Curated annotation (Swiss-Prot), chain C:
Swiss-Prot/TrEMBL catalytic activity: D-mannonate = 2-dehydro-3-deoxy-D-gluconate + H2O; D-gluconate = 2-dehydro-3-deoxy-D-gluconate + H2O
Stated role: Has low dehydratase activity with D-mannonate and D-gluconate, suggesting that these are not physiological substrates and that it has no significant role in the in vivo degradation of these compounds. Has no detectable activity with a panel of 70 other acid sugars (in vitro).
Protein known as: D-galactonate dehydratase family member Dd703_0947
Named cofactor requirement(s): Mg(2+)
Xref: Pfam families: MR_MLE_C, MR_MLE_N
Length: 395, 395, 396, 395
């Protein structure tokens, strides 16, 4: 008797970043579910994938068969395993989980095993043009109670002279950046000590052997993790990196394929998995990945940037709450508009997030207010990255 | 405010086999859980492990924290990873899942992802003094609707002449056995054709190279799987077997340790994992193992012998209904007394089991009728197996 | 026509810790064997395994067929390889070896190959709340003649992280604070005590694998005798990575209960010392095989010798130690007068060496009347409920 | 204080084959041990090694420290690990286990674990000029109760025409031999069925790839094992063989070095280990090897040819009785002179050996009687083996 009746996409940008949220409606009045489908750079293609394909696929189906729906939806177009398609899956799969919590009168984290911890430790971003400005941010965050911070200085060497004419793009200098990082952590550790945990994100910006040298050279500074030392396309290089360095490694925010993460985890080539939950297809595959990670002694560090709706932020945190091998939660602070469009955002208190104990994902969306923040769209400029000679780089 | 108030063990043998069942009670009316702790050969030590250690560990705690309770209970005695300790964990763990289901008003399979299939295909046992009587039992089961059957002939050579005086034991002949099997199956395929699926259990009765030769020789007869070709102590020999044979392999009913199954599944050394759910610690670790197997393309075939309670049977089947990588369910038909003592046994109809949609595991125990069948105790004769020269062997 | 006539458990706690000892009686009056079955956290379940299962299995059987009995008892329940079941095996196994030595008029170490050394070097525990207390305790043990010491400061960090606003009960620790703190501790010890003294540190599975690898690398200059339990049994695959990078000697194994745990480690040279609790792997018979397998791979023995092992198990450790060419070290926990009185025959301790007597079998007895005067406490220890700062239940 | 007072070597040939036996005497009345040092082709050098080196090394030492003495003697001349050195070591070591047994009042097998089986299954040799005389020898042995036989025909081809000149030697033809073996076994299996167990010894006579083909071609004939398909110098070729063949393999009669057997056993490259007990250093090292093998699921098959003293026959069998992984025992019938010179020979009855229950090794030597059978000495012809072109080969 219980059936899905409609599946819609809501495009909104209350925090200044384009989000896509899927609402799954049922034939029981007042019962619906929400999921995150935020691939911010391709939101109009996610909307199209949802509206043209997922909706007619799902109408009339029983929403509680979460796994049957996930498996059959994922193969419905034959070709599969990519970010746009995975996000259409995630919008729906999170919405079904959310519905299931509502039917059970339980938060999703109670369905997945119950609380494994009393609060969810967070890290946040601290930027700076130089060593002194970065420290200032770290200081401001420490006073708010963060015990973990990600430290970047500048924009990856944004130093060598270019040729006499340049093709447009955002120019960076990988070797300049690579030499400056150790100097940054020497300063920070000297200034602030070793109580505070540091994360640094290489963001696939240097060649693999440069990343290996960096990992080795940062060993004295004891990072919580070094993130993204290679692109997904270069993951075989981690065999060599892990023969030589003891700095903790994270990878995975870019992953969209089991053949990317499985070999890393099987071989202990990373210490934290960083997948963007919606980008791997939602709660159902993320839970599986978390378990695979757990048995291999690898911990989770779900991607938590600004380009994730509060619905996905709840999703991450429900997974965090119920995972024994939870590592840490990246967190990007929200504005008032986001909290008003999405009542139920988790409470943030002194470096910890406390999720509410409302049923499902414990999160709502106000469609009326959402319409007041239409999406910008447009090509981001920062993904056009060039090295000093003008070579287009993975950004 | 919800609390565990009592934990007790019930020993009963309605089917003529010593069963152990754990009841977990709470301070909410009508809200309790049952789980299976059946390790039938050490039932009195499992009772001691539950009564002396688990029960005081649990009284007063929040039963919804299934993962936290499982993790902390499993390390409560420091040493861990064994069949008695695991069965004590399982009795609690399945009971906590049973309780969660009741709180949510849902079958456990609904909590674990929902229905993946319309029914659970079963296999049953068929024995016989010879190729003629085995074939008669196979026909009988095919009339009842079974489409998969396990074929054994005799008791593994129970032939070389023994020495002049024999030390007591159940004597078998591993070489006579191994030669006779391929003839068993040549006869069965000629008789019955290739429509019916056949399983054969080596039960660790031969040397590893002998099992490899047996697996190779049975290839033409196309077994659904060849079970336990090696003892858990000899798992490294499966590397050799899998370079040479294409007969599908199941392993794991004896497994109690992740270091036993993780290497085999990681290297594609088996096709079906056979763990006895309570012996690995219950639904919680069993679900993780199902997922681990899933990502590696290995399917489940949970142990379903006579020495498992109807509660453990229901756990198997709830795992079976929510696993996309479900392989097959071994089934031992129950007598009237078992169905009377355990209200809610799955319905068995033409080779399929159909679970009820009742909340939790959908199963209960009548404590008064259970008392009419006290456990026998004693040590089984069959675990004292000797080869022709008198050597004590892994049964 | 020698036969086993009865098998019984004695549960006693003369040193404040609960012990289980097995007595195997025969139809030869006065001839019996004693074995250690001490799994202290589960002694009542161990007692049940022996009383309900081992007893009927063994009554009537010829006690001299140690290997046959071990093999047939180990698989008597079909399921096998776990701490309670191995301890019931061990109680019987050591008791049979004890009987064989009594029949032969020889200590067990004589049946296992005879003396390979002239005494058994020991290490003792030295703890402290801070660097100086550790060092003071070290100086006190050196004065008693100890030449190896295990050094732990504090309780695994329990500058610690702030926890969330409510805490679930448990014993709280902070693995990152602990990790940072260890190298500082050894730099102090070495600067104050020099390099003559041998140091052992136990990580006790308290940190993530890559943290332990970093720790092993950082400790290299301080030259530990061994770094113990860098990973949990569940994580042994991480030792492949640690052994590609660190030259700190490693020991593993007090938690081991399964061959599929230790065989790949030793085959691949992933550790330098095997640390099994002898009763927890099933007694002298399997311990001797492990020692031999180790030897051929160049790995040495360091059998677990905590407070929670009876003096009979201690004698077993030492008869194995006396007869192994690849003996590494023997952890020793000093006994009080009550242990010595309940178990006459305890080995002599003298200037960091232990000297086993030359009486037949394990050379140890039990005064059953005196044993009854120290009943077992029981209960659940609090320490195995360990939580990191956010509240997560941890491997203790 | 118990001390070794004398060590002498006794060379004798009661069975037509040069034997060496060591007697270690002590300062306790009636307390002496015997052991085997029989490297029959080099007996005179083995006597020199014992008389000039071992004897003075031992005098005045305590014979109960078997392991200390073994370890320290093994390295007493610095260089080590060879057949002559090992044999001198065996002679003392077996003697010391013999002394320990007499002190204990127990058979050596009781010191090593107690009885593991009720008697020792034997195999014997059956040779023949052709396929039909071989059969006749098999029937003869079957009448005497042997259930396992080793089947060879002729002399490994002893067919291409050789060059016009021929260097002296025993000529064979490996290519003709390889092609004859599978035909021998097909004939024998056709005539004798699969009740009787067959062994075949390739004796390092063919190239490695030829042995692999042989191993595969014989699979249908189901040998108990195929022995020595490669020379010790060619063990790396077993990796290839075991990827392709399921015929059980035995190796090791020629082994004298741990780096020979340890790789084969770790990697499951053999099923039976075939070492000559005295040629690896006696009971002490063989027992360690039996245990290393057991932990890897490999079974023992100690060398039991004519060039072993009945003292060595007794040591094989005391190992055989106390080994859970015993596989089979090769046995060469003794004549009346051997049984007269060596009182305490095992009783042989219908294909089983039954060792006496006397203390130590239960065997002794009549020195006066031994002197009536002096050692011929000399150089055997058979080890000068040539292929058709004249090439000196591994015999
Ligand atoms: Cl799609
Ligand atoms: Cl037991
Ligand atoms: Cl020599
Ligand atoms: Mg990043
Ligand atoms: Mg089975
Ligand atoms: Mg320790
Ligand atoms: Mg040979």
């Amino acid at each position: 008797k219980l059936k899905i009746t409609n599946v819609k996409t809501i495009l909104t940008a209350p925090g200044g970043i384009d989000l896509a949220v899927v609402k799954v409606e049922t034939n029981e009045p007042g019962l619906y579910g929400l999921g995150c489908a935020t691939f911010t750079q391709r939101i109009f293609a996610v909307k199209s994938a949802i509206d043209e394909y997922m909706a007619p696929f799902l109408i009339g189906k029983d929403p509680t068969r979460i796994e049957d729906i996930w498996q059959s939806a994922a193969v419905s177009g034959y070709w599969r395993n990519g970010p746009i398609m995975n996000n259409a899956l995630s919008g729906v799969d999170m919405a079904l989980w959310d519905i299931k919590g509502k039917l059970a009168g339980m938060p999703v984290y109670e369905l997945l095993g119950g609380k494994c911890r009393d609060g969810i430790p967070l890290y946040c971003h601290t930027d700076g043009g130089d060593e002194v400005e970065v420290e200032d941010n770290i200081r401001a965050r420490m006073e708010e109670g963060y015990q973990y911070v990600r430290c970047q200085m500048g924009m990856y060497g944004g130093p060598k002279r270019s040729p006499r004419s340049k093709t447009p793009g955002i120019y960076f200098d990988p070797e300049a950046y690579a030499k400056s990082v150790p100097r940054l952590f020497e300063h920070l550790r000297n200034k602030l000590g070793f109580g505070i945990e540091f994360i640094h994100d290489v963001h696939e910006r240097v060649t693999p052997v440069t990343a290996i040298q960096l990992a080795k050279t940062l060993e004295p500074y004891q990072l919580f993790y070094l993130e993204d030392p290679v692109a997904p396309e270069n993951i075989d290089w981690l065999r060599m990196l892990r023969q030589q360095s003891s700095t903790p490694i994270s990878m995975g925010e870019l992953f969209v394929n089991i053949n990317e993460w499985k070999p890393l985890i099987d071989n202990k080539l990373i210490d934290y998995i960083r997948c963007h939950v919606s980008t791997i297809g939602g709660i159902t595959p993320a839970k599986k990945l978390a378990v695979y990670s757990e048995l291999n002694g690898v911990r989770t560090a779900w991607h938590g940037p600004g380009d994730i709706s509060p619905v996905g932020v709840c999703a991450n945190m429900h997974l965090d709450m119920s995972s024994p091998n939870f590592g840490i939660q990246e967190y990007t602070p929200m504005n008032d508009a986001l909290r008003e469009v999405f009542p139920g955002c988790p409470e943030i208190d002194q470096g910890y997030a406390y999720v509410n104990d409302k049923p499902g994902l414990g999160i709502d969306i106000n469609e009326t207010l959402a319409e007041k923040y239409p999406c910008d769209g447009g090509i981001p400029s920062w993904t056009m990255a060039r090295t000093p000679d003008g070579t287009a780089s993975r950004p």
